[PDB]
Amino acid sequence: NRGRLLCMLALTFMFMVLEVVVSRVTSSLAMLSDSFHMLSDVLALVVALVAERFARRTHATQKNTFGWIRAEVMGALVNAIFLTGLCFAILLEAIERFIEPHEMQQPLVVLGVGVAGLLVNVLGLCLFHHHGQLNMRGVFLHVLGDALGSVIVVVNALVFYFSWKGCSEGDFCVNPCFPDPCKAFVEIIVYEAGPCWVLYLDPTLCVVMVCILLYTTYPLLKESALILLQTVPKQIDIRNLIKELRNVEGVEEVHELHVWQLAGSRIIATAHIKCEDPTSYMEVAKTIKDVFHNHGIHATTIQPEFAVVPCELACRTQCALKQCC
Amino acid sequence: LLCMLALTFMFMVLEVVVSRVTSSLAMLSDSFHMLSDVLALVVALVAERFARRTHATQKNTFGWIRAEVMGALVNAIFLTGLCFAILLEAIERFIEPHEMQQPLVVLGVGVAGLLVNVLGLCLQLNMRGVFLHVLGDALGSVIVVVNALVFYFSWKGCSEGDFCVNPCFPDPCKAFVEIINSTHASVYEAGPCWVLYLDPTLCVVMVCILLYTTYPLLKESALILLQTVPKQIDIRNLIKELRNVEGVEEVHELHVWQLAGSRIIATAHIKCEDPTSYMEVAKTIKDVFHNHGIHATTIQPEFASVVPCELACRTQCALKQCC
Ligand SMILES: CC(C)CCC[C@@H](C)[C@H]1CC[C@H]2[C@@H]3CC=C4C[C@@H](OC(=O)CCC(=O)O)CC[C@]4(C)[C@H]3CC[C@]12C
Numbered sequence: 001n002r003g004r005l006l007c008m009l010a011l012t013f014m015f016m017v018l019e020v021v022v023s024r025v026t027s028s029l030a031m032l033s034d035s036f037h038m039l040s041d042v043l044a045l046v047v048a049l050v051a052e053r054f055a056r057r058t059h060a061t062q063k064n065t066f067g068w069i070r071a072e073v074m075g076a077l078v079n080a081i082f083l084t085g086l087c088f089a090i091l092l093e094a095i096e097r098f099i100e101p102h103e104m105q106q107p108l109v110v111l112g113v114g115v116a117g118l119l120v121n122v123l124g125l126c127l128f129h130h131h132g133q134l135n136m137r138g139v140f141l142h143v144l145g146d147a148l149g150s151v152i153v154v155v156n157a158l159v160f161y162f163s164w165k166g167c168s169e170g171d172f173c174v175n176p177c178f179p180d181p182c183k184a185f186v187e188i189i190v191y192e193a194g195p196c197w198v199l200y201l202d203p204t205l206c207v208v209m210v211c212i213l214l215y216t217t218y219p220l221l222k223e224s225a226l227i228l229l230q231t232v233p234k235q236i237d238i239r240n241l242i243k244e245l246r247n248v249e250g251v252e253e254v255h256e257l258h259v260w261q262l263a264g265s266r267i268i269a270t271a272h273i274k275c276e277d278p279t280s281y282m283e284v285a286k287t288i289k290d291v292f293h294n295h296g297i298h299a300t301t302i303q304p305e306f307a308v309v310p311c312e313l314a315c316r317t318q319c320a321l322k323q324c325c
Numbered sequence: 326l327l328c329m330l331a332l333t334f335m336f337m338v339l340e341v342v343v344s345r346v347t348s349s350l351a352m353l354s355d356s357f358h359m360l361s362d363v364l365a366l367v368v369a370l371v372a373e374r375f376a377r378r379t380h381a382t383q384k385n386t387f388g389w390i391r392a393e394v395m396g397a398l399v400n401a402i403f404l405t406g407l408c409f410a411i412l413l414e415a416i417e418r419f420i421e422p423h424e425m426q427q428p429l430v431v432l433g434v435g436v437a438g439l440l441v442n443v444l445g446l447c448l449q450l451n452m453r454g455v456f457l458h459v460l461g462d463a464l465g466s467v468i469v470v471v472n473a474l475v476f477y478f479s480w481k482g483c484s485e486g487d488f489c490v491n492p493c494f495p496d497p498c499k500a501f502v503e504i505i506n507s508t509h510a511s512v513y514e515a516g517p518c519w520v521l522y523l524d525p526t527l528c529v530v531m532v533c534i535l536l537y538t539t540y541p542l543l544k545e546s547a548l549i550l551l552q553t554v555p556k557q558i559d560i561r562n563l564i565k566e567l568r569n570v571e572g573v574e575e576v577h578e579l580h581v582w583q584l585a586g587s588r589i590i591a592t593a594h595i596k597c598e599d600p601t602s603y604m605e606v607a608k609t610i611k612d613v614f615h616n617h618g619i620h621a622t623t624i625q626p627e628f629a630s631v632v633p634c635e636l637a638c639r640t641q642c643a644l645k646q647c648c
């Protein structure tokens with residue numbers, strides 16, 4: 001399953017190579033800036049790949065009792081947070097550009113690199129649209145946002161090429177809205193085409209792309225936080241399980257019951273319940289195990305308790321604030 | 326603290342606005358650090374509010390006590406992302422250098438940042454806890470201050486018609502296509518390489534120091550959050566001590582993880598010998614855990630084969646049941 005990540009990384013490196021070649025042949029720092037921008041996506045792909053590689057190992061090592069299966073969701077959360085930070089930086093840059101306008105040069109090469117990146121991201125997203133792994137969904141969202149930004153840049157460059165006249169101080173081109181550098185040397189001791197309508201196009205496109213990306217990734221962040229913060233997921237309700245356990249004649253009371261998911265469908269519940277007599281403890285244990293298996297529970301550690309007090313067992317002395325919840 | 330948090334947030338907003346209006350990479354890094362700090366304060370306040378009346382809500386039986394460490398990790402990751410963005414900006418500045426407008430405004434902003442950083446940890450547990458943070462913030466502000474001072478002290482700019490503009494430095498239409506077309510005033514740039522390189526090198530050093538400082542916190546948060554044994558407990562020694570107990574003969578499904586802080590969770594699965602008694606051994610194993618860092622014990626005993634655990638269900642356990 002790592003082949004998709006590997007080929008995505010290879011495509012990113014190929015894009016880096018073509019972008020740096022274009023920068024060298026055209027002597028434009030904008031291509032280098034674009035390569036640095038795509039380095040964030042390359043890093044996200046590397047994070048996804050290493051997360052998958054560590055998820056491939058579930059041998060219950062010395063330090064990790066459960067195993068590094070949680071690394072998948074943790075890396076998904078890290079990638080989502082990195083995408084959010086990149087969006088915040090992009091929003092700051094967009095605000096600065098709206099305050100301080102800045103055009104672009106060599107629209108042909110810009111369009112070529114933009115459409116190349118758009119094709120790369122489309123190929124990546126089509127392969128990633130096979131959809132269960134939350135990290136895969138996060139990387140898919142990230143790639144979709146990238147693609148949206150790339151196509152927005154392509155459209156902005158194309159519409160800029162359609163109507164805009166460059167100048168070499170021979171003819172007055174920049175509109176009065178755009179501040180000339182040092183008043184063009186006091187006007188050296190046509191007014192172009194599309195003075196300011198095209199100027200607002202790129203900020204609007206990038207901010208709407210950022211908003212769409214944030215709205216699409218917010219459910220991913222919510223799911224990652226809910227699963228990671230040890231909260232009961234859907235299809236499992238504490239009230240229904242408590243009712244289905246209490247009415248069982250084997251148990252007498254239920255207390256200290258904790259339910260947290262491990263990864264995806266892997267969920268573990270711990271119950272500390274009290275029983276009447278040791279006789280037929282398997283009959284009670286088998287019954288409650290079957291009831292839990294009826295719900296989403298498959299693995300659990302249910303502690304029988306034998307005889308007012310909240311729990312027969314407790315921490316040494318009256319020390320508190322160390323017991324769970 | 327809340328008023329201090331609001332004041333720091335306002336100062337960070339003004340610093341970000343000033344950096345945007347002046348393209349100051351060092352000021353941008355200082356504002357990023359201030360933003361990270363204010364979000365850390367917001368996360369701490371949210372955690373305190375949540376834990377003020379934390380209970381076993383239907384959403385989480387285990388409680389929301391992990392929110393503090395989770396928010397700390399989110400703040401750390403956000404700071405790392407902003408730092409990588411700043412590093413990319415510094416690389417771009419290496420490719421495309423820029424010259425700042427008003428060094429005096431930058432110097433004033435840096436002085437104000439130093440003052441607010443000093444005032445931060447002055448208000449106790451806070452002083453001892455954040456002395457290192459105050460020192461680091463002071464160093465970061467001082468870096469920006471000295472960079473701005475060096476820029477203002479020696480740089481000579483071609484505000485009017487003069488030849489001091491560096492041809493290697495980008496120029497408007499190549500000095501407006503050599504607008505003067507003659508010998509201009511060779512006021513010189515006063516070592517532009519010595520000058521223009523100061524800000525990017527300074528911000529690179531600052532972000533390197535920031536990552537060096539925040540990295541151990543990131544590893545601590547990652548270890549605490551993802552299910553890992555605490556540094557104060559040895560798994561092999563603990564299980565060897567547990568197996569010494571007469572009641573238990575073998576163990577399976579042994580899991581240890583910690584909620585947050587000093588909270589410890591331990592799960593056991595004991596085959597036992599005589600399930601009828603269950604006395605003088607449950608207390609024994611409870612004491613066995615408690616003499617170690619465990620305080621919350623969930624040691625469920627199995628009652629008696631070839632199968633590791635008799636209680637068990639479908640094969641889905643392979644993909645559902647914990648190892
Ligand atoms: C090029 C950019 C992206 C990063 C430039 C800085 C890194 C090369 C430095 C900054 C902090 C360094 C880390 C700081 C501390 C440690 C711990 C140390 O390794 C251990 O885990 C030993 C025990 C310990 O000291 O915690 C040495 C490697 C490492 C990860 C360092 C690896 C190199 C890092 C990431």
Ligand SMILES: [Zn+2]
Nearest residue numbers: 040041142146
């Ligand atoms: Zn991306």
Ligand SMILES: [Zn+2]
Nearest residue numbers: 293298638639
């Ligand atoms: Zn099952």
Ligand SMILES: [Zn+2]
Nearest residue numbers: 305310311312
């Ligand atoms: Zn009890």
Ligand SMILES: [Zn+2]
Nearest residue numbers: 256323324325
């Ligand atoms: Zn509890």
Ligand SMILES: [Zn+2]
Nearest residue numbers: 358362458462
């Ligand atoms: Zn600070």
Ligand SMILES: [Zn+2]
Nearest residue numbers: 315615619620
């Ligand atoms: Zn204890």
Ligand SMILES: [Zn+2]
Nearest residue numbers: 627633634635
């Ligand atoms: Zn068993």
Ligand SMILES: [Zn+2]
Nearest residue numbers: 578579647648
């Ligand atoms: Zn297990």
